[PDB]
């Protein structure tokens, strides 16, 4: 059953690599969007200060 071996590894290797990468890639996108939220907070504070 070469297929069980192909599947046992394909399931794990293709997914752990692609999936964990999406977790951290998006974590950075999300952190940047969170920075945008901070920058909007900053923008709101600056408009009020002016």
């Amino acid at each position: 059953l070469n297929e069980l071996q192909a599947l046992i590894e394909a399931h794990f290797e293709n997914r752990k690599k692609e999936e964990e990468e999406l977790v951290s890639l998006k974590d950075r996108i999300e952190r940047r969007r969170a920075e945008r939220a901070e920058q909007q907070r900053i923008r709101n504070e600056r408009e009020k200060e002016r």
Binding site: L1, E3, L4, L7, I8, H11
Partner: peptide, 29 residues
């Protein structure tokens, strides 16, 4: 868990064949 639906069948065949033999071996007298 299709990997083991398939492993199950393989082991099922291995035991069924060993079992077929256990039964025959006893049946043969």
């Amino acid at each position: 868990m299709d990997a083991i639906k398939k492993k199950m069948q393989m082991l099922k065949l291995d035991k069924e064949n060993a079992l077929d033999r256990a039964e025959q071996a006893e049946a043969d007298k």
